[PDB]
Design a protein around this nucleic acid. Structure first.
Length: 50
DNA sequence: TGCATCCGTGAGTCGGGTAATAACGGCCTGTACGCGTCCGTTTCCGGCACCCCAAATGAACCGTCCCTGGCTCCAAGGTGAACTCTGGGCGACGAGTG
């Protein structure tokens, strides 16, 4: 599924659109350390992804 | 009444073909073939009695497949805010630096 289909918010949508993360398959493949490396990452984004 | 004298029986299996003598006119005809002429056949040009036959020549024709009128009734486009990152700019502080 697309991550946006999970009814996410402004910062997460902008991060997935500018960078190019499209499906939750790559998110479930990527670990928490591999996803928190992004700069200007939001604590709310971390909480919702967790 | 033997006795020789034939006499007639029989005796296995999957390169070819090799020749004389005196014979010779003369006449008849029988069938197949050739010549010339003649005639039924058939084969092809032409005409109306008309048989008309026909695509081509005049309508509608009107329902339908094209235009115009305008009316809407809604979702795309334009209008705010604030806000939550997003980022720029800013100040603080130090231990390797001088």
């Amino acid at each position: 599924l697309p991550i946006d289909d999970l009814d996410l918010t402004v910062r997460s949508y902008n991060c997935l659109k500018r960078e190019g993360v499209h499906t939750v398959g790559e998110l479930v493949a990527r670990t928490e350390s591999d996803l928190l490396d992004i700069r200007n990452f939001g604590q709310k984004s971390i909480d919702e992804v967790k």
